Amino acid sequence: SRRARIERRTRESDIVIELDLDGTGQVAVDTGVPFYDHMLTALGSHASFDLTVRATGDVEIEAHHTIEDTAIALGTALGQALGDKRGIRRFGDAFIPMDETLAHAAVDLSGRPYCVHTGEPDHLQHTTIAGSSVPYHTVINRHVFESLAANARIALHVRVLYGRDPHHITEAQYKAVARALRQAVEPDPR
Amino acid sequence: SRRARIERRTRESDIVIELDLDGTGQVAVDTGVPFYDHMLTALGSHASFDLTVRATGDVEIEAHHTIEDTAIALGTALGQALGDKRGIRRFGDAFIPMDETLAHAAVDLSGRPYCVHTGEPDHLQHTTIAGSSVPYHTVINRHVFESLAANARIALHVRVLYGRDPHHITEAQYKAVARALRQAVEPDPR
Amino acid sequence: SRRARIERRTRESDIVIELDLDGTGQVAVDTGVPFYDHMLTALGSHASFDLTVRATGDVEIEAHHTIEDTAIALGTALGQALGDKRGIRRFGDAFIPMDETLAHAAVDLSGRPYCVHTGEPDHLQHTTIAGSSVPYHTVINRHVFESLAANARIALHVRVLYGRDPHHITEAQYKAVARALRQAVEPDPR
Amino acid sequence: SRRARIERRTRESDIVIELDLDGTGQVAVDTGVPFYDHMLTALGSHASFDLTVRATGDVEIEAHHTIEDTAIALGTALGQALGDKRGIRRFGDAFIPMDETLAHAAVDLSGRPYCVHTGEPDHLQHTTIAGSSVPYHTVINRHVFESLAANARIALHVRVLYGRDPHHITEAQYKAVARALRQAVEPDPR
Amino acid sequence: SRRARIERRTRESDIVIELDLDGTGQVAVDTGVPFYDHMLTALGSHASFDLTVRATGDVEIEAHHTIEDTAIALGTALGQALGDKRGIRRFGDAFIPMDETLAHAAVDLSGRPYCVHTGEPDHLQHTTIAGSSVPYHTVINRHVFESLAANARIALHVRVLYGRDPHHITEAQYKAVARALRQAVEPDPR
């Protein structure tokens, strides 16, 4: 079994992650940042992980610290769950069309952090996705992928080929990471 | 079983489609537009569909009306055959090299029409592929992919990375759509 | 003697080639594509080959498949006829002026496919030469030279220095290939 | 079984290839060019081939002749091992992230040579990878992929999306070719 | 008979050339610079010369002095062997395709040194061809052709039309010079 439980308590946040790589998309995410909840639920579900995330942090400041602590904890869990990485596909990639948006992610697990994020339209460096709760600043997308890659110790390449809507651009990237991971972690029959 | 029979009779054309998603590439296409017959035969065959298409239309005008009515009928059949889309991979993509040409298609079935067509060389907006019968104006390629996507209610992204020969560029795109669909419709074991 | 007979039967076409390198320009070509017949007759004749080509293919679609299958079969015949390539000039080149057009070809037989096609005016990527029969799309010129080179296993460099008329540009290139081959295949007295 | 043994003895080199497409990555390569040994070992291993390569050539001149003769022999072996290509996926592609580098390869086996190599940074046309033995001039990468494609009679498209380190750029391309081939040669269950 | 033996002993090198213009390509070259050995062997052989070159020089410094002294000695031998140049074609030219590379040389013997070298890609001014022995700096190509022309007292025009690989670009130029010389030195029957 490829399960990990990570507890991460900092001055800024309190995180619990329970991750199973060999899941059916049983996913529950509650961080206090509802758009981030949606993105991590999409990630767990499209990866066919079982994933629970419970995070409380300093959202009076903004989402950044909670988002980052969550991504660090989640990456740590992914790395621990992967163990020796013996017998897995190792390489994975996925294209995700979302209406006008096309995103792609490619991964190499096998143990050296690296993240390359390209093609995200420049308006996403100062876009806010806002509802009735704590908002999500899309400039953080890159930071989430970097933190994941750095703590899981994997190579993660995330690309936006084109798109316009910041919700479509963001969600397609999270889904692309998710399906790339799904393919990479699967047993390689050879 | 994931089969559909569509009959579409308009002022301009008369179409019958019999489609099975779970096929072995048993394909017979007769539209009166032989290059289109070739492209739809390539599509059915590379998708591992069973597909029969019988169309008669107003080819004295040109192929456009028959091509469009056929693509609408075929997309309708694909949507009906997909039913609830329960348990399928949903996402699919395929690269197709054809000598100098590289084409790509990515699909998301799961229920909102969208089509993005990019990178086709500009000479394909006024190219004719002509033999001894009704010719095929390559400007129609985009129209075929749009009509398919709109009537199957799927997201279809078709890209030409590079190429020169209009037959290679056209056929690689039809084949790319076909293999992307093949992957997307397949049962997802998870 | 440097003779080869190639029969090539595909789903798309039926080809018979009889080639003698040591000929007097006794040439008969019938492919169902009369401008291609003219170009291959010019090639056989200006190479001082004896050449018969009988091809029937799917010209209801367009000339492409028949043209390509013919060029593959012809290149195969050229390679077989050349045998060990012992004692031949190996290198050949020819300039062909045709009114306003100047074309050139250079060849190296001795056994590694390579084709470089340069300087053809851009209007030839979407030009049609049309008469009362199956038309010829000049974009195919490059494809013919590539298929020949790849199946004869020779280096073929075809250049258009300048020109305007697509018939002159096309015919001068076929003639240039023909005279370059003629020189390359001839016994080298040293 | 899909095995081939090729012996190729030229004025410049002496090659023996034993190739099994249906392997477990049992790979032994010795050419006298240790970086090339590494690249061909990566290729055999990531393709899940069993592969032995023993080559001795004129490395006093430089690696080029031995590298080229090896790639020709290896491509010949791949083509022979593939036989009729009945029942295989035929199409394959793979993305390979290697730290900062992202490379891609796409293949079509089914029987016409073609190679398109794009996006390799210009500094790789005059880069040397040098250790204590015979060095490797990265300008040869393109030549290796061309020779492989031409002798296996396949379409091979190799792309560098981006990268900096010439070892990462080179190794990611060899690995991408390897995983694309792996997917293409696998039995297609349909 | 058109034979010359040149001995050239300098502070830097020791050269012996035996040249016969009316040869069969009986060629033996040993300079201590194996890529140069290969280029001069190609030159002698493609010119249908009989040629022996034995050179020892200061290769601890680099190949330059030995290469230059050899080219001077060889040019001197070519000039002496040509004698009165009575009854020869005088003018010669040759195109040499080498995979992606096309090179050309044109010569006028009849008695005034001149060398024009054009079209060599700029990367060849700082490229090294390196094996297990003394390497070859391609910037020297021009110097070799200049030294040959100046000491044989001939006009030599060497052109690279296009190419990429520095070994193909260099070898095609040496072969082009060789076949141009072959044609120029041959008896003119008129």
Next chain:
Amino acid sequence: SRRARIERRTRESDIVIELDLDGTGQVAVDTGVPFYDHMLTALGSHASFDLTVRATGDVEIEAHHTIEDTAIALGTALGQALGDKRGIRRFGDAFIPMDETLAHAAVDLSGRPYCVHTGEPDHLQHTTIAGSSVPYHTVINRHVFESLAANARIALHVRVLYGRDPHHITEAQYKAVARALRQAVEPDPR
């Protein structure tokens, strides 16, 4: 025998041409324009023609009328001497290096006038070559080649690849035409 005698008497000039295509370069030219005498002597001699030209014209005006009448008469003689053009090479080309200058000419005899003149440096449109007699305005070079081609009824393509000295540029073009004609008129043994 391929001989012609042309007498051309106009208001401006009096011309006699005796031409033998199958000559040994027995050439005598006297037009009253000594640089033109030199160019036509070079042409006759390098073509291996036997050629006598006696022209007297209105050189008080300038050389133009005499030069043009001579070129018309000479072209007429070349056409008449060629007769049916049965059994000849038909195509000919020649490169001529002259110190810094490289010129080329290509010819097709077989019966439709055409002349393309390219690459002559712009300073040759207003250059004078002057001695102690009637001078030669190099702008006339093009006119001479046009008049020759038009009256012999041949395709003549003359190119200057590069050069500086107007005497070298002019003389290399006349010599290139001469050697191209020599090759084209020779019996083709096939």
